[PDB]
Write an enzyme that holds these catalytic residues in place. Structure first.
Site, PDB file in Angstrom:
ATOM      1  N   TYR A  37      -5.331   7.389  -2.313  1.00  0.00           N
ATOM      2  CA  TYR A  37      -5.635   7.966  -1.006  1.00  0.00           C
ATOM      3  C   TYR A  37      -4.572   9.001  -0.611  1.00  0.00           C
ATOM      4  O   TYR A  37      -4.253   9.151   0.585  1.00  0.00           O
ATOM      5  CB  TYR A  37      -5.807   6.871   0.050  1.00  0.00           C
ATOM      6  N   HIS A  98       6.662   0.911  -4.585  1.00  0.00           N
ATOM      7  CA  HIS A  98       5.704  -0.070  -4.092  1.00  0.00           C
ATOM      8  C   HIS A  98       5.248  -1.031  -5.194  1.00  0.00           C
ATOM      9  O   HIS A  98       4.123  -0.941  -5.729  1.00  0.00           O
ATOM     10  CB  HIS A  98       4.545   0.643  -3.371  1.00  0.00           C
ATOM     11  N   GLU A 136       7.311  -5.520  -2.368  1.00  0.00           N
ATOM     12  CA  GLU A 136       6.962  -6.957  -2.273  1.00  0.00           C
ATOM     13  C   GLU A 136       7.220  -7.693  -3.546  1.00  0.00           C
ATOM     14  O   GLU A 136       6.298  -8.020  -4.297  1.00  0.00           O
ATOM     15  CB  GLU A 136       5.508  -7.134  -1.840  1.00  0.00           C
ATOM     16  N   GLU A 225       6.093  -3.014   6.492  1.00  0.00           N
ATOM     17  CA  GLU A 225       4.635  -3.039   6.359  1.00  0.00           C
ATOM     18  C   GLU A 225       4.100  -4.206   7.149  1.00  0.00           C
ATOM     19  O   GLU A 225       4.561  -5.348   7.016  1.00  0.00           O
ATOM     20  CB  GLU A 225       4.227  -3.170   4.887  1.00  0.00           C
ATOM     21  N   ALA A 231      -4.096 -11.240   5.060  1.00  0.00           N
ATOM     22  CA  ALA A 231      -3.068 -10.865   4.090  1.00  0.00           C
ATOM     23  C   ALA A 231      -3.576 -10.104   2.881  1.00  0.00           C
ATOM     24  O   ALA A 231      -2.773  -9.521   2.145  1.00  0.00           O
ATOM     25  CB  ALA A 231      -2.306 -12.109   3.637  1.00  0.00           C
ATOM     26  N   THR A 232      -4.887 -10.083   2.683  1.00  0.00           N
ATOM     27  CA  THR A 232      -5.535  -9.286   1.641  1.00  0.00           C
ATOM     28  C   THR A 232      -5.701  -7.811   2.005  1.00  0.00           C
ATOM     29  O   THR A 232      -6.133  -7.038   1.159  1.00  0.00           O
ATOM     30  CB  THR A 232      -6.946  -9.817   1.434  1.00  0.00           C
ATOM     31  N   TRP A 259       0.073  -0.745   7.943  1.00  0.00           N
ATOM     32  CA  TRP A 259      -0.777  -0.559   6.742  1.00  0.00           C
ATOM     33  C   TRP A 259      -2.233  -0.499   7.238  1.00  0.00           C
ATOM     34  O   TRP A 259      -2.689  -1.504   7.818  1.00  0.00           O
ATOM     35  CB  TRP A 259      -0.606  -1.774   5.840  1.00  0.00           C
ATOM     36  N   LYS A 264     -10.661   3.629   3.506  1.00  0.00           N
ATOM     37  CA  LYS A 264     -11.195   2.529   2.739  1.00  0.00           C
ATOM     38  C   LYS A 264     -11.884   1.525   3.640  1.00  0.00           C
ATOM     39  O   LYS A 264     -11.438   1.226   4.764  1.00  0.00           O
ATOM     40  CB  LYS A 264     -10.060   1.833   1.962  1.00  0.00           C
ATOM     41  N   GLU A 266     -11.969  -1.563   4.476  1.00  0.00           N
ATOM     42  CA  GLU A 266     -11.278  -2.820   4.637  1.00  0.00           C
ATOM     43  C   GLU A 266     -10.716  -2.805   6.046  1.00  0.00           C
ATOM     44  O   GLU A 266     -10.374  -1.770   6.575  1.00  0.00           O
ATOM     45  CB  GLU A 266     -10.195  -3.050   3.599  1.00  0.00           C
TER      46      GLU A 266
HETATM   47  O1  LIG Z   1      -2.889  -7.116   0.854  1.00  0.00           O
HETATM   48  C1  LIG Z   1      -2.575  -6.138   1.859  1.00  0.00           C
HETATM   49  C2  LIG Z   1      -1.320  -5.367   1.459  1.00  0.00           C
HETATM   50  C3  LIG Z   1      -0.127  -6.312   1.391  1.00  0.00           C
HETATM   51  N1  LIG Z   1       1.105  -5.547   1.127  1.00  0.00           N
HETATM   52  C4  LIG Z   1       1.020  -4.731  -0.118  1.00  0.00           C
HETATM   53  C5  LIG Z   1      -0.157  -3.784  -0.083  1.00  0.00           C
HETATM   54  O2  LIG Z   1      -0.175  -3.111  -1.310  1.00  0.00           O
HETATM   55  C6  LIG Z   1      -1.444  -4.581   0.178  1.00  0.00           C
HETATM   56  O3  LIG Z   1      -2.506  -3.649   0.264  1.00  0.00           O
HETATM   57  C7  LIG Z   1      -3.676  -4.003  -0.462  1.00  0.00           C
HETATM   58  O4  LIG Z   1      -3.399  -3.889  -1.826  1.00  0.00           O
HETATM   59  C8  LIG Z   1      -4.538  -4.243  -2.615  1.00  0.00           C
HETATM   60  C9  LIG Z   1      -4.067  -4.298  -4.036  1.00  0.00           C
HETATM   61  O5  LIG Z   1      -3.487  -3.032  -4.404  1.00  0.00           O
HETATM   62  C10 LIG Z   1      -5.644  -3.213  -2.329  1.00  0.00           C
HETATM   63  O6  LIG Z   1      -6.783  -3.535  -3.137  1.00  0.00           O
HETATM   64  C11 LIG Z   1      -5.998  -3.225  -0.873  1.00  0.00           C
HETATM   65  O7  LIG Z   1      -6.951  -2.171  -0.617  1.00  0.00           O
HETATM   66  C12 LIG Z   1      -4.752  -3.001  -0.003  1.00  0.00           C
HETATM   67  O8  LIG Z   1      -5.033  -3.136   1.358  1.00  0.00           O
END
Ligand SMILES: OC[C@H]1CNC[C@@H](O)[C@@H]1O[C@@H]1O[C@H](CO)[C@@H](O)[C@H](O)[C@H]1O
Length: 300
Positions: A37, A98, A136, A225, A231-232, A259, A264, A266
Site C-alpha cells: 500500500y 517491520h 514486533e 502502533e 489484534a488481527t 494502524w 484494505k 479490514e
Molecule cells: O494484526 C494487526 C497488525 C499488528 N501489528 C503488526 C501489523 O503488521 C499487523 O497488521 C496486519 O498484518 C497482517 C499480516 O501482515 C495483514 O494481513 C493485515 O492486513 C494487517 O492489518
C-alpha cells in the site's frame, strides 16, 4: 511548524521532551506495509494528514518479510520518500524495520545493521527521524534478555556512530506487549524508548496497568502502533475501548501512531475503497476507524 517548534527530541526522566525540556506528545498515522500500500505514502497524502487531521508524526512500516525489504529491497526508497516528505512538511517520522513473521529480530540482523547504517548516514543530522528497529518480536523463544536486548545492543551502536541522540524505539516481546521485562532490564542508551502496541478488540485493563508498571521503572514508552480493531487488524471496530486507551495515553504523555493508512477491507484500515492516494478525503471516504482516529488527532 511542529519540528521547528519542538526541535530535537530527547528522553528526560522517562518522558519524551522537546529541546526546551518540555513534554511533547506525538500523534499520527502508520502506513500499512509499504510493499502492498505504498501508493498512500507521498508528500501530498502526508500534507493532507498534517493539515486536515493534525498529524505530527508519520510511521513508515517497512515489512522485512512478507514480500518486503528482504524479498525486494526497492521498498527502502519509499521509506526515503516518506522521510523526505516529513522533513519538507516539518513533522516527525518513524523508520520502522517491520518484523513480524520473521519473529526474532536476529534473523535479519545483518541486513538491519546495514539498513540503519544507510538511513542514519542519510538522515542523522535532521531532528525529524525516529528509528524503530524491530516492530514486533514474538514467540515464546524470543525474549527480551536473550534475543531482543542483544539485538538492540548491536543495532544501536551502528545508528549512534552516525546519529548520536535521535530517538530509537525498541520492540518488546509478545508482539511488543512485554514492557514489564524490558523495564526491568533497560538498555543503556539515554534516548531509547520501548514499543508498546495494543488493539482495542482486546480487553485492556491489565495491559494499561503493565504500561504503568514500566513507566514506574523510569522506562519511556512509545505506542508506535495501535488499532481500533481486534489484534488481527480486522474483526470489528471497538471504539469504546479505543477511547479508554486514548484517554490513558493522554494522561501518561504517551505518543502514538495508528494502524493504518490504507483502503484494505479490514476494520483497522482508515480509508474506504475510493479514497484518493494523494489525500483530500471526504467523510464518506474515511472508514469508521479513520473517522474516529481523525477526530482524536483534530481534538488534540
Ligand atoms: O494484526 C494487526 C497488525 C499488528 N501489528 C503488526 C501489523 O503488521 C499487523 O497488521 C496486519 O498484518 C497482517 C499480516 O501482515 C495483514 O494481513 C493485515 O492486513 C494487517 O492489518
Amino acid at each position: 511548524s511542529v519540528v521547528e517548534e519542538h526541535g530535537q527530541l530527547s528522553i528526560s526522566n522517562g518522558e519524551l521532551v522537546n529541546e526546551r525540556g518540555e513534554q511533547v506528545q506525538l500523534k499520527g498515522m502508520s502506513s500499512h506495509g509499504l510493499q502492498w500500500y505504498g501508493q498512500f505514502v507521498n508528500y501530498e497524502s502526508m500534507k493532507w494528514l498534517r493539515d486536515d487531521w493534525g498529524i505530527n508524526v508519520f510511521r513508515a512500516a517497512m515489512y522485512t518479510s512478507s514480500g518486503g525489504y528482504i524479498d525486494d529491497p526497492s521498498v527502502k526508497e519509499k521509506v526515503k520518500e516518506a522521510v523526505e516528505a516529513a522533513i519538507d512538511l516539518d513533522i516527525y517520522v518513524i523508520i520502522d524495520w517491520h518484523i513480524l513473521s520473521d519473529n526474532d529480530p536476529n534473523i535479519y540482523k545483518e541486513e538491519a545493521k546495514d539498513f540503519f547504517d544507510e538511513m542514519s548516514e542519510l538522515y542523522g543530522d535532521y531532528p525529524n527521524v525516529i528509528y524503530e528497529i524491530a516492530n514486533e518480536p514474538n514467540g515464546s523463544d524470543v525474549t527480551w534478555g536473550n534475543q531482543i536486548k542483544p539485538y538492540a545492543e548491536e543495532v544501536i551502536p551502528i545508528i549512534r556512530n552516525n546519529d548520536p541522540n535521535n530517538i530509537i524505539i525498541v520492540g518488546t516481546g509478545t508482539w511488543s506487549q512485554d514492557v514489564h521485562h524490558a523495564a526491568d532490564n533497560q538498555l543503556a542508551d539515554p534516548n531509547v524508548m520501548y514499543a508498546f502496541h495494543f488493539y482495542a478488540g482486546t480487553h485492556g485493563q491489565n495491559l494499561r496497568d503493565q504500561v504503568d508498571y514500566a513507566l514506574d521503572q523510569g522506562a519511556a514508552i512509545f505506542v508506535s502502533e495501535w488499532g481500533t480493531s481486534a489484534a488481527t487488524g480486522d474483526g470489528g471496530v471497538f471504539l469504546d475501548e479505543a477511547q479508554v486507551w486514548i484517554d490513558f495515553m493522554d494522561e501518561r504523555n504517551l505518543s502514538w501512531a495508528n494502524w493504518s493508512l490504507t483502503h484494505k477491507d479490514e476494520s483497522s484500515a482508515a480509508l474506504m475503497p475510493g479514497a484518493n492516494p494523494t489525500g483530500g478525503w471526504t467523510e464518506a471516504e474515511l472508514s469508521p476507524s479513520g473517522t474516529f482516529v481523525r477526530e482524536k488527532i483534530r481534538e488534540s
